[PDB]
Amino acid sequence: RLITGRLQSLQTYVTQQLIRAAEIRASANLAATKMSECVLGQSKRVDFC
Amino acid sequence: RLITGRLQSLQTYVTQQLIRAAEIRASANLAATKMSECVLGQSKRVDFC
Amino acid sequence: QCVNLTTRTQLPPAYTNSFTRGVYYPDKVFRSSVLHSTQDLFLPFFSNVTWFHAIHVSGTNGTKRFDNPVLPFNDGVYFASTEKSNIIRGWIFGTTLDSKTQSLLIVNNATNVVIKVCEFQFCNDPFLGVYYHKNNKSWMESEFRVYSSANNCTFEYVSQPFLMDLEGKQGNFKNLREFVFKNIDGYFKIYSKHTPINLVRDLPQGFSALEPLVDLPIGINITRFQTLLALHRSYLTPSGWTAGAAAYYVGYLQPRTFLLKYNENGTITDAVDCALDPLSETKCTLKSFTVEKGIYQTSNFRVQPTESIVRFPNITNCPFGEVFNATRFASVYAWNRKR
Amino acid sequence: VQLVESGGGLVQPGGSLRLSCAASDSSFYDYEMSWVRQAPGKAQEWIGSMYPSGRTYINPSLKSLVTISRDNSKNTLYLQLNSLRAEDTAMYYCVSNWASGSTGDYWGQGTLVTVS
Amino acid sequence: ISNCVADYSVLYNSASFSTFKCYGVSPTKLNDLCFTNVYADSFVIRGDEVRQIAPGQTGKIADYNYKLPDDFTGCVIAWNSNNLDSKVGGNYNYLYRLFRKSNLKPFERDISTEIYQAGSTPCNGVEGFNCYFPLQSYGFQPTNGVGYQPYRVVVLSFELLHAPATVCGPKKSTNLVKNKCVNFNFNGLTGTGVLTESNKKFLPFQQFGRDIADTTDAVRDPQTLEILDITPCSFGGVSVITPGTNTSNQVAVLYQDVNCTEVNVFQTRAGCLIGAEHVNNSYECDIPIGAGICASYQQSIIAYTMSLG
Amino acid sequence: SNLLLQYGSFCTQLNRALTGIAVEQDKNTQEVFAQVKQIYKTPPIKDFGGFNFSQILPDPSKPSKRSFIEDLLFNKVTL
Ligand SMILES: *[C@@H]1O[C@H](CO)[C@@H](O[C@@H]2O[C@H](CO)[C@@H](O)[C@H](O)[C@H]2NC(C)=O)[C@H](O)[C@H]1NC(C)=O
Ligand SMILES: *[C@@H]1O[C@H](CO)[C@@H](O[C@@H]2O[C@H](CO)[C@@H](O)[C@H](O)[C@H]2NC(C)=O)[C@H](O)[C@H]1NC(C)=O
Ligand SMILES: *[C@@H]1O[C@H](CO)[C@@H](O)[C@H](O)[C@H]1NC(C)=O
Ligand SMILES: *[C@@H]1O[C@H](CO)[C@@H](O)[C@H](O)[C@H]1NC(C)=O
Ligand SMILES: *[C@@H]1O[C@H](CO)[C@@H](O)[C@H](O)[C@H]1NC(C)=O
Ligand SMILES: *[C@@H]1O[C@H](CO)[C@@H](O)[C@H](O)[C@H]1NC(C)=O
Ligand SMILES: *[C@@H]1O[C@H](CO)[C@@H](O)[C@H](O)[C@H]1NC(C)=O
Ligand SMILES: *[C@@H]1O[C@H](CO)[C@@H](O)[C@H](O)[C@H]1NC(C)=O
């Protein structure tokens, strides 16, 4: 009863991290894009930079 | 005892396949714009193409 | 019986590292070109095997020494024996090797091998003899000095002989045989194979898987075994003893995890012993014999706790003496409850 | 089971039979074994006895019928008998230390040798 | 006799049997239990001593000769042996003892023929007054009937001690049919699938093979030592291709990745498709079937290989 | 199997999800490549001012008319 409860509690936190990691990664691709164009360039895109 | 273990094991791959699919659909949308802006035109966005 | 004369030797054993030896099929399942991980009893790679000497090689006029005595065998051992000539009929597997206990007997008897799991009364020096008897014109193979009494006959075995001659090239191979003696759940198993030896005494680095031979439903608790030998007498070829010579090796098994390669046709081409060195552990977790560059996490290690303590307070007392150190006790109709 | 009796069976009058008694060890022979029977009315007279070192003495007046031999490999016993008669109407016993009473011994199986 | 195969069903139609007396084992299910050791004792008893000689009896015989455990797991055989122990003149050689001190314990060999007194004075080894003999000889006469006739009785008594069990009978057998979906039982391996002829190489000490992840693939037939493959019986989803319930009520069924021979009829790279007729044209895709093949409805349902433009 | 009907419709959620994300894989490829209404063809004469383009155009050779480079990609992943 303790093994199944503790094991199943751990699977939630691995699963919530994987969802929360994909949110950080999606924001770490915008920052990489925003760096190439806003900083190393001079963008014409509106409200982007 | 086997059903609650096999069912829980099966529900792990459906959940993990769903997160992997969001990874591919995120780069299958990037590959779609790069085929529209880099290939079907000339882009001024820095470091994109 | 039981000629008792050693009285001279207490030499320690020679220790070597068996390069890649002691790999077996812990199942009866065919496997294609697969890599499999098993957790059974195996000899750790590069372990100190006690190199014992068989009937010695000291040639002045006969006089070959016998310095291979009683041995212990915890859970499983190897018997890598060269034996250019037949010197061991079998072994003295058992518990105490005396009366009232069943001694597991294996004897060559190279027409039909017999296993006799019954109570016996073996002594310290059971030995052989093969010569004439002035009748039938041959060198008969009487085995009377081996055992005195065969009591409470219970089990039987008749099959082909385990050992044979396969050199055919003036020696230089010795037809090495290695054996494993496992007894788990009362089932006794033996593994063997014919291999050649090019060194004078030492073991090569070659790899060879040793297939199973026999499963025995014996069912006896195991504590200790003993080794057998064969000293046929001598005649006018210069009392009468000291015939034959070889070299033996005895190791010890341990519960270890192995990763065993498989050829396209079941032969274990290679194996790796986990829990030796970090590289072996890296292969065992990845299940691969070729590992690319990188940093790989194999396992955890914790600082095991040392001697444990317990701490409790002071004021460990009431005067129980005032109950028992009373000068006189009262009448048996006036029992007191000194609460 | 220390001692086991081998062979024997029902005997036709005018026939012959051979007995046997497998021995646990040569050490238990010390110092008088027994090929004992229970003859009808006749007293308990020892027939087969022997020694651990390999001696043999037999009763002079009853040795015209009984012969003894041994082999040391199987520790089997040979009691080669000839001209069996009605003086054996019982089932035999081959028990060690028989002469010391009927309580300091182990009883095995025994064999029956009777005629009409 | 041990470490072999026993049979009891044949023992029903072998000789003339009289009474089936079984303790602790159902007589219709004699081929289930595994015991440690076998003590095969088959001998001869009297006629009324099928009941008069039995475990837990008193009087003369059962108390003092041998005792067997009243916890039997087996059967007691009863035949008619009037031609074995009854001979003219009498088989008085054997001994029906009268009385002793107490009983025995199960599976003991207590055979002593000591003489038991009725009083207390010692005979000093000489038979005489008050030296009553508890030994009595067997009484067999051809004139005497069931009250003294002999009956062949074989008692198969099995111990309930704690030890490994080795001696049982098998579950044989049937023949072989190959290339068919059948459920097989190979030496304790229970499964189903298609048995075919293989070309692999087992080492001559193995029973069955498996590639990866405990998926058994080949099992050697233990009659001819031939290696037989295992392939699971085919399956796969079933799809219904419809042009809309108002356009028509005609459909075509697709079996997901199933050969046609194992079910117009057409074979696609995505399974077998029935009810739709293949055409050599190529139109814009309407209902995607898979692997480059689509289908639509234009008074029948037809299948294409879609055109890109 | 009759013991599994007590767990409701967990067996139908899993099928619906996997079928859901198996249709997408046909939408990912559909969106990337299918962006031209018509299939254009290079003229049989190749006169592009000096630029070669031969390594990337399809060839009159073995079927599955992939270029000299697409074959390298179709042989470096297939394991
Ligand atoms: C059994 O194992 C051996 C080890 O490789 C292999 O034997 C080869 O088999 C192929 C075809 O099966 C033959 O062309 C070769 O002559 C064999 N060579 C050797 C060195 O054995 C194979 O995996 C298995 N097949 C056998 C012995 O026929
Ligand atoms: C354009 O590219 C092709 C290669 O795809 C060139 O064809 C080569 O021409 C040479 C002539 O000497 C041959 O030896 C080669 O076998 C051809 N293949 C390669 C890989 O070199 C072709 O010449 C080029 N056309 C130009 C530059 O005008
Ligand atoms: C050697 O073994 C023999 C057995 O025959 C015995 O007589 C003798 O006492 C032994 N000598 C020892 C233990 O020193
Ligand atoms: C193995 O052999 C030597 C020889 O005695 C022994 O002392 C030691 O335990 C081992 N040496 C090493 C390096 O393991
Ligand atoms: C050969 O067999 C045994 C071995 O000792 C022997 O007793 C016997 O005398 C020999 N055979 C003959 C016919 O002598
Ligand atoms: C009781 O009195 C005796 C005196 O001989 C002494 O030894 C003993 O320790 C006393 N018991 C207690 C609990 O004090
Ligand atoms: C289907 O079954 C038949 C065997 O009758 C076989 O010839 C055929 O190759 C199999 N596969 C296909 C795609 O037809
Ligand atoms: C399709 O194949 C050829 C033309 O490609 C034609 O001769 C044949 O009649 C056609 N068969 C069907 C069923 O359309």
PDB file of N, CA and C in Angstrom, chain E residues 89-140:
ATOM      1  N   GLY E  89      -3.828 -79.058   2.413  1.00  0.00           N
ATOM      2  CA  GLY E  89      -2.883 -79.325   3.478  1.00  0.00           C
ATOM      3  C   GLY E  89      -2.674 -78.112   4.358  1.00  0.00           C
ATOM      4  N   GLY E  90      -2.636 -76.933   3.745  1.00  0.00           N
ATOM      5  CA  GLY E  90      -2.552 -75.701   4.528  1.00  0.00           C
ATOM      6  C   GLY E  90      -1.260 -74.939   4.305  1.00  0.00           C
ATOM      7  N   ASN E  91      -1.395 -73.617   4.193  1.00  0.00           N
ATOM      8  CA  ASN E  91      -0.241 -72.719   4.141  1.00  0.00           C
ATOM      9  C   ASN E  91      -0.017 -72.115   5.528  1.00  0.00           C
ATOM     10  N   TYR E  92       0.085 -73.008   6.511  1.00  0.00           N
ATOM     11  CA  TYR E  92       0.217 -72.640   7.916  1.00  0.00           C
ATOM     12  C   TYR E  92       1.589 -72.070   8.260  1.00  0.00           C
ATOM     13  N   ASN E  93       2.437 -71.818   7.261  1.00  0.00           N
ATOM     14  CA  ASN E  93       3.768 -71.284   7.529  1.00  0.00           C
ATOM     15  C   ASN E  93       3.701 -69.874   8.106  1.00  0.00           C
ATOM     16  N   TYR E  94       2.800 -69.039   7.590  1.00  0.00           N
ATOM     17  CA  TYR E  94       2.729 -67.654   8.029  1.00  0.00           C
ATOM     18  C   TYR E  94       2.077 -67.570   9.410  1.00  0.00           C
ATOM     19  N   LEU E  95       2.122 -66.374  10.001  1.00  0.00           N
ATOM     20  CA  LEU E  95       1.828 -66.191  11.421  1.00  0.00           C
ATOM     21  C   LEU E  95       0.753 -65.126  11.614  1.00  0.00           C
ATOM     22  N   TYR E  96      -0.406 -65.538  12.132  1.00  0.00           N
ATOM     23  CA  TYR E  96      -1.438 -64.615  12.601  1.00  0.00           C
ATOM     24  C   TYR E  96      -1.300 -64.492  14.113  1.00  0.00           C
ATOM     25  N   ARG E  97      -0.653 -63.426  14.567  1.00  0.00           N
ATOM     26  CA  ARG E  97      -0.343 -63.294  15.981  1.00  0.00           C
ATOM     27  C   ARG E  97      -1.613 -62.976  16.770  1.00  0.00           C
ATOM     28  N   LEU E  98      -1.609 -63.339  18.054  1.00  0.00           N
ATOM     29  CA  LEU E  98      -2.805 -63.213  18.884  1.00  0.00           C
ATOM     30  C   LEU E  98      -2.886 -61.858  19.579  1.00  0.00           C
ATOM     31  N   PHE E  99      -1.922 -61.551  20.445  1.00  0.00           N
ATOM     32  CA  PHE E  99      -1.949 -60.309  21.204  1.00  0.00           C
ATOM     33  C   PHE E  99      -0.529 -59.872  21.528  1.00  0.00           C
ATOM     34  N   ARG E 100      -0.354 -58.559  21.659  1.00  0.00           N
ATOM     35  CA  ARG E 100       0.882 -57.972  22.157  1.00  0.00           C
ATOM     36  C   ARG E 100       0.531 -56.855  23.130  1.00  0.00           C
ATOM     37  N   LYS E 101       1.546 -56.063  23.473  1.00  0.00           N
ATOM     38  CA  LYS E 101       1.376 -54.996  24.450  1.00  0.00           C
ATOM     39  C   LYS E 101       0.574 -53.840  23.865  1.00  0.00           C
ATOM     40  N   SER E 102       1.099 -53.206  22.818  1.00  0.00           N
ATOM     41  CA  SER E 102       0.501 -51.995  22.272  1.00  0.00           C
ATOM     42  C   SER E 102       0.632 -52.019  20.752  1.00  0.00           C
ATOM     43  N   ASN E 103       0.266 -50.903  20.129  1.00  0.00           N
ATOM     44  CA  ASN E 103       0.241 -50.786  18.679  1.00  0.00           C
ATOM     45  C   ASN E 103       1.610 -50.340  18.170  1.00  0.00           C
ATOM     46  N   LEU E 104       1.669 -49.964  16.897  1.00  0.00           N
ATOM     47  CA  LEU E 104       2.887 -49.499  16.248  1.00  0.00           C
ATOM     48  C   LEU E 104       2.695 -48.056  15.785  1.00  0.00           C
ATOM     49  N   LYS E 105       3.665 -47.567  15.018  1.00  0.00           N
ATOM     50  CA  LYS E 105       3.566 -46.287  14.343  1.00  0.00           C
ATOM     51  C   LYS E 105       3.632 -46.500  12.835  1.00  0.00           C
ATOM     52  N   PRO E 106       3.070 -45.585  12.047  1.00  0.00           N
ATOM     53  CA  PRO E 106       3.025 -45.791  10.595  1.00  0.00           C
ATOM     54  C   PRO E 106       4.412 -45.897   9.976  1.00  0.00           C
ATOM     55  N   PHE E 107       4.529 -46.796   8.994  1.00  0.00           N
ATOM     56  CA  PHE E 107       5.770 -47.018   8.246  1.00  0.00           C
ATOM     57  C   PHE E 107       6.938 -47.385   9.161  1.00  0.00           C
ATOM     58  N   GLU E 108       6.690 -48.302  10.091  1.00  0.00           N
ATOM     59  CA  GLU E 108       7.744 -48.924  10.880  1.00  0.00           C
ATOM     60  C   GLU E 108       7.828 -50.406  10.547  1.00  0.00           C
ATOM     61  N   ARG E 109       9.017 -50.975  10.718  1.00  0.00           N
ATOM     62  CA  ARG E 109       9.277 -52.386  10.445  1.00  0.00           C
ATOM     63  C   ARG E 109       9.506 -53.077  11.787  1.00  0.00           C
ATOM     64  N   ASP E 110       8.413 -53.434  12.455  1.00  0.00           N
ATOM     65  CA  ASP E 110       8.465 -54.130  13.738  1.00  0.00           C
ATOM     66  C   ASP E 110       7.942 -55.543  13.505  1.00  0.00           C
ATOM     67  N   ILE E 111       8.861 -56.505  13.505  1.00  0.00           N
ATOM     68  CA  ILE E 111       8.597 -57.857  13.040  1.00  0.00           C
ATOM     69  C   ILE E 111       8.827 -58.893  14.133  1.00  0.00           C
ATOM     70  N   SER E 112       9.361 -58.482  15.283  1.00  0.00           N
ATOM     71  CA  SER E 112       9.795 -59.416  16.316  1.00  0.00           C
ATOM     72  C   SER E 112       8.668 -60.350  16.738  1.00  0.00           C
ATOM     73  N   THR E 113       9.014 -61.621  16.936  1.00  0.00           N
ATOM     74  CA  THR E 113       8.068 -62.680  17.284  1.00  0.00           C
ATOM     75  C   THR E 113       8.173 -63.080  18.748  1.00  0.00           C
ATOM     76  N   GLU E 114       8.393 -62.115  19.639  1.00  0.00           N
ATOM     77  CA  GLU E 114       8.601 -62.428  21.045  1.00  0.00           C
ATOM     78  C   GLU E 114       7.346 -63.042  21.655  1.00  0.00           C
ATOM     79  N   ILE E 115       7.554 -63.910  22.639  1.00  0.00           N
ATOM     80  CA  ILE E 115       6.453 -64.610  23.290  1.00  0.00           C
ATOM     81  C   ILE E 115       5.929 -63.759  24.438  1.00  0.00           C
ATOM     82  N   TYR E 116       4.613 -63.578  24.484  1.00  0.00           N
ATOM     83  CA  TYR E 116       3.961 -62.736  25.476  1.00  0.00           C
ATOM     84  C   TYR E 116       3.253 -63.611  26.502  1.00  0.00           C
ATOM     85  N   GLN E 117       3.526 -63.354  27.779  1.00  0.00           N
ATOM     86  CA  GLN E 117       2.949 -64.117  28.875  1.00  0.00           C
ATOM     87  C   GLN E 117       1.514 -63.681  29.153  1.00  0.00           C
ATOM     88  N   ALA E 118       0.825 -64.492  29.954  1.00  0.00           N
ATOM     89  CA  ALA E 118      -0.466 -64.117  30.512  1.00  0.00           C
ATOM     90  C   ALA E 118      -0.393 -63.788  31.996  1.00  0.00           C
ATOM     91  N   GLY E 119       0.617 -64.294  32.701  1.00  0.00           N
ATOM     92  CA  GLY E 119       0.807 -63.998  34.108  1.00  0.00           C
ATOM     93  C   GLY E 119       2.061 -63.185  34.355  1.00  0.00           C
ATOM     94  N   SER E 120       2.865 -63.586  35.342  1.00  0.00           N
ATOM     95  CA  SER E 120       4.087 -62.864  35.666  1.00  0.00           C
ATOM     96  C   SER E 120       5.305 -63.748  35.889  1.00  0.00           C
ATOM     97  N   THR E 121       5.136 -65.052  36.086  1.00  0.00           N
ATOM     98  CA  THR E 121       6.281 -65.914  36.341  1.00  0.00           C
ATOM     99  C   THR E 121       7.137 -66.047  35.082  1.00  0.00           C
ATOM    100  N   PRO E 122       8.467 -66.085  35.223  1.00  0.00           N
ATOM    101  CA  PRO E 122       9.336 -66.157  34.040  1.00  0.00           C
ATOM    102  C   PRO E 122       9.587 -67.582  33.570  1.00  0.00           C
ATOM    103  N   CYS E 123       9.435 -67.817  32.263  1.00  0.00           N
ATOM    104  CA  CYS E 123       9.661 -69.145  31.704  1.00  0.00           C
ATOM    105  C   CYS E 123      11.137 -69.520  31.659  1.00  0.00           C
ATOM    106  N   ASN E 124      12.038 -68.542  31.779  1.00  0.00           N
ATOM    107  CA  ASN E 124      13.483 -68.774  31.705  1.00  0.00           C
ATOM    108  C   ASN E 124      13.875 -69.468  30.402  1.00  0.00           C
ATOM    109  N   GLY E 125      13.245 -69.060  29.304  1.00  0.00           N
ATOM    110  CA  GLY E 125      13.607 -69.552  27.991  1.00  0.00           C
ATOM    111  C   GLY E 125      13.072 -70.918  27.634  1.00  0.00           C
ATOM    112  N   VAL E 126      12.240 -71.518  28.482  1.00  0.00           N
ATOM    113  CA  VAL E 126      11.696 -72.853  28.254  1.00  0.00           C
ATOM    114  C   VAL E 126      10.181 -72.738  28.168  1.00  0.00           C
ATOM    115  N   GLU E 127       9.611 -73.230  27.071  1.00  0.00           N
ATOM    116  CA  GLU E 127       8.174 -73.130  26.845  1.00  0.00           C
ATOM    117  C   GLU E 127       7.428 -74.151  27.695  1.00  0.00           C
ATOM    118  N   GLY E 128       6.411 -73.687  28.419  1.00  0.00           N
ATOM    119  CA  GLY E 128       5.660 -74.552  29.309  1.00  0.00           C
ATOM    120  C   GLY E 128       4.426 -73.909  29.909  1.00  0.00           C
ATOM    121  N   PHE E 129       4.225 -74.108  31.210  1.00  0.00           N
ATOM    122  CA  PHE E 129       3.049 -73.577  31.888  1.00  0.00           C
ATOM    123  C   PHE E 129       3.089 -72.053  31.931  1.00  0.00           C
ATOM    124  N   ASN E 130       1.931 -71.435  31.695  1.00  0.00           N
ATOM    125  CA  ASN E 130       1.739 -69.985  31.671  1.00  0.00           C
ATOM    126  C   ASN E 130       2.525 -69.294  30.564  1.00  0.00           C
ATOM    127  N   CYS E 131       3.249 -70.045  29.741  1.00  0.00           N
ATOM    128  CA  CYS E 131       3.995 -69.474  28.621  1.00  0.00           C
ATOM    129  C   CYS E 131       3.162 -69.551  27.343  1.00  0.00           C
ATOM    130  N   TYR E 132       1.999 -68.908  27.395  1.00  0.00           N
ATOM    131  CA  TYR E 132       1.083 -68.921  26.264  1.00  0.00           C
ATOM    132  C   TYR E 132       1.706 -68.220  25.063  1.00  0.00           C
ATOM    133  N   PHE E 133       1.517 -68.808  23.886  1.00  0.00           N
ATOM    134  CA  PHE E 133       2.130 -68.295  22.670  1.00  0.00           C
ATOM    135  C   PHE E 133       1.192 -67.303  21.996  1.00  0.00           C
ATOM    136  N   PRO E 134       1.614 -66.057  21.764  1.00  0.00           N
ATOM    137  CA  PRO E 134       0.778 -65.143  20.973  1.00  0.00           C
ATOM    138  C   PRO E 134       0.852 -65.409  19.483  1.00  0.00           C
ATOM    139  N   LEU E 135       1.813 -66.208  19.031  1.00  0.00           N
ATOM    140  CA  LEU E 135       1.901 -66.546  17.618  1.00  0.00           C
ATOM    141  C   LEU E 135       0.898 -67.640  17.275  1.00  0.00           C
ATOM    142  N   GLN E 136       0.122 -67.418  16.216  1.00  0.00           N
ATOM    143  CA  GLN E 136      -0.739 -68.447  15.656  1.00  0.00           C
ATOM    144  C   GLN E 136      -0.551 -68.497  14.147  1.00  0.00           C
ATOM    145  N   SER E 137      -0.551 -69.712  13.612  1.00  0.00           N
ATOM    146  CA  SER E 137      -0.292 -69.943  12.200  1.00  0.00           C
ATOM    147  C   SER E 137      -1.510 -69.591  11.352  1.00  0.00           C
ATOM    148  N   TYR E 138      -1.256 -69.304  10.076  1.00  0.00           N
ATOM    149  CA  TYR E 138      -2.338 -69.073   9.128  1.00  0.00           C
ATOM    150  C   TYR E 138      -3.156 -70.343   8.934  1.00  0.00           C
ATOM    151  N   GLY E 139      -4.475 -70.188   8.888  1.00  0.00           N
ATOM    152  CA  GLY E 139      -5.345 -71.309   8.597  1.00  0.00           C
ATOM    153  C   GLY E 139      -5.944 -71.238   7.208  1.00  0.00           C
ATOM    154  N   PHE E 140      -5.427 -72.044   6.285  1.00  0.00           N
ATOM    155  CA  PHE E 140      -5.931 -72.101   4.918  1.00  0.00           C
ATOM    156  C   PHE E 140      -6.358 -73.524   4.592  1.00  0.00           C
TER     157      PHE E 140
END
